[PDB]
Design a protein around this motif. Sequence first.
Motif, PDB file in Angstrom:
ATOM      1  N   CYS A 281     -22.980 -22.386 -28.186  1.00 31.83           N
ATOM      2  CA  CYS A 281     -21.350 -22.278 -28.391  1.00 31.83           C
ATOM      3  C   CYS A 281     -20.570 -23.329 -27.349  1.00 31.83           C
ATOM      4  CB  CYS A 281     -20.850 -21.022 -27.843  1.00 31.83           C
ATOM      5  SG  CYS A 281     -21.585 -19.720 -28.974  1.00 31.83           S
TER       6      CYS A 281
ATOM      7  N   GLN B 106     -29.005  -8.316 -35.335  1.00 33.51           N
ATOM      8  CA  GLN B 106     -29.203  -9.640 -36.171  1.00 33.51           C
ATOM      9  C   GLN B 106     -29.973 -10.733 -35.695  1.00 33.51           C
ATOM     10  OE1 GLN B 106     -28.379  -9.144 -39.383  1.00 33.51           O
ATOM     11  NE2 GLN B 106     -27.245  -7.241 -38.589  1.00 33.51           N
TER      12      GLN B 106
ATOM     13  N   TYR C 168     -26.297 -19.607 -37.992  1.00 35.37           N
ATOM     14  CA  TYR C 168     -25.158 -19.324 -38.648  1.00 35.37           C
ATOM     15  C   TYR C 168     -24.596 -17.887 -37.837  1.00 35.37           C
ATOM     16  CZ  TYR C 168     -22.224 -17.262 -42.616  1.00 35.37           C
ATOM     17  OH  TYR C 168     -21.107 -16.886 -43.017  1.00 35.37           O
ATOM     18  N   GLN C 169     -25.459 -17.006 -37.592  1.00 36.76           N
ATOM     19  CA  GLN C 169     -24.933 -15.810 -36.908  1.00 36.76           C
ATOM     20  C   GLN C 169     -24.624 -15.973 -35.614  1.00 36.76           C
ATOM     21  OE1 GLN C 169     -24.717 -12.632 -38.085  1.00 36.76           O
ATOM     22  NE2 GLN C 169     -24.668 -13.367 -40.093  1.00 36.76           N
TER      23      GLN C 169
ATOM     24  N   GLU D  44     -23.339 -18.592 -34.299  1.00 35.17           N
ATOM     25  CA  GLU D  44     -21.966 -19.057 -34.230  1.00 35.17           C
ATOM     26  C   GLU D  44     -20.824 -18.095 -34.328  1.00 35.17           C
ATOM     27  OE1 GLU D  44     -21.890 -22.916 -36.501  1.00 35.17           O
ATOM     28  OE2 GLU D  44     -22.221 -23.786 -34.401  1.00 35.17           O
ATOM     29  N   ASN D  45     -21.007 -16.817 -35.100  1.00 33.09           N
ATOM     30  CA  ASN D  45     -20.253 -15.796 -35.183  1.00 33.09           C
ATOM     31  C   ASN D  45     -19.620 -15.294 -33.985  1.00 33.09           C
ATOM     32  OD1 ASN D  45     -20.006 -15.964 -37.968  1.00 33.09           O
ATOM     33  ND2 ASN D  45     -21.763 -14.503 -38.267  1.00 33.09           N
ATOM     34  N   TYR D  46     -20.398 -15.486 -32.885  1.00 40.11           N
ATOM     35  CA  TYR D  46     -20.067 -14.984 -31.591  1.00 40.11           C
ATOM     36  C   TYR D  46     -19.464 -16.098 -30.407  1.00 40.11           C
ATOM     37  CZ  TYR D  46     -22.492 -11.001 -33.689  1.00 40.11           C
ATOM     38  OH  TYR D  46     -22.785  -9.959 -34.402  1.00 40.11           O
ATOM     39  N   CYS D  47     -19.206 -17.283 -30.966  1.00 39.30           N
ATOM     40  CA  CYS D  47     -18.548 -18.189 -30.312  1.00 39.30           C
ATOM     41  C   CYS D  47     -17.216 -17.874 -30.352  1.00 39.30           C
ATOM     42  CB  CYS D  47     -18.713 -19.702 -30.836  1.00 39.30           C
ATOM     43  SG  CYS D  47     -20.488 -20.106 -30.580  1.00 39.30           S
TER      44      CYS D  47
END
Lengths: 30, 30, 21, 21
Positions: B19, C5, C14-15, C17-20
């Motif tokens: 991130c 997950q 993919y997953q 980056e859902n938490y960035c």
Amino acid sequence: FVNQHLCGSHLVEALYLVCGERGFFYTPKT
Amino acid sequence: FVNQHLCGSHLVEALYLVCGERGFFYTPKT
Amino acid sequence: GIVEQCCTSICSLYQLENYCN
Amino acid sequence: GIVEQCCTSICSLYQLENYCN
């Protein structure tokens, strides 16, 4: 471990250890 | 490093590396 | 959530980056 | 933010807990 300069992975580690199962948010942008 | 089982500090590290300056939220409760 | 997950099952970029932010 | 309080200056438990969920 908390009472020092903590940066990057070192800061994320401290948050992880302090916050436990609650988790945390790491927002260096804010 | 992302395509494996990642738990605890190992997961937090992966989020940190992926991130970047955006940061991330680690919410194992959710 | 993220534990299910990425810890209990195999994680992916993919997953993550859902938490960035 | 957290970088200013804990990286650039000396961190504290008090401040870290401000970022727990």
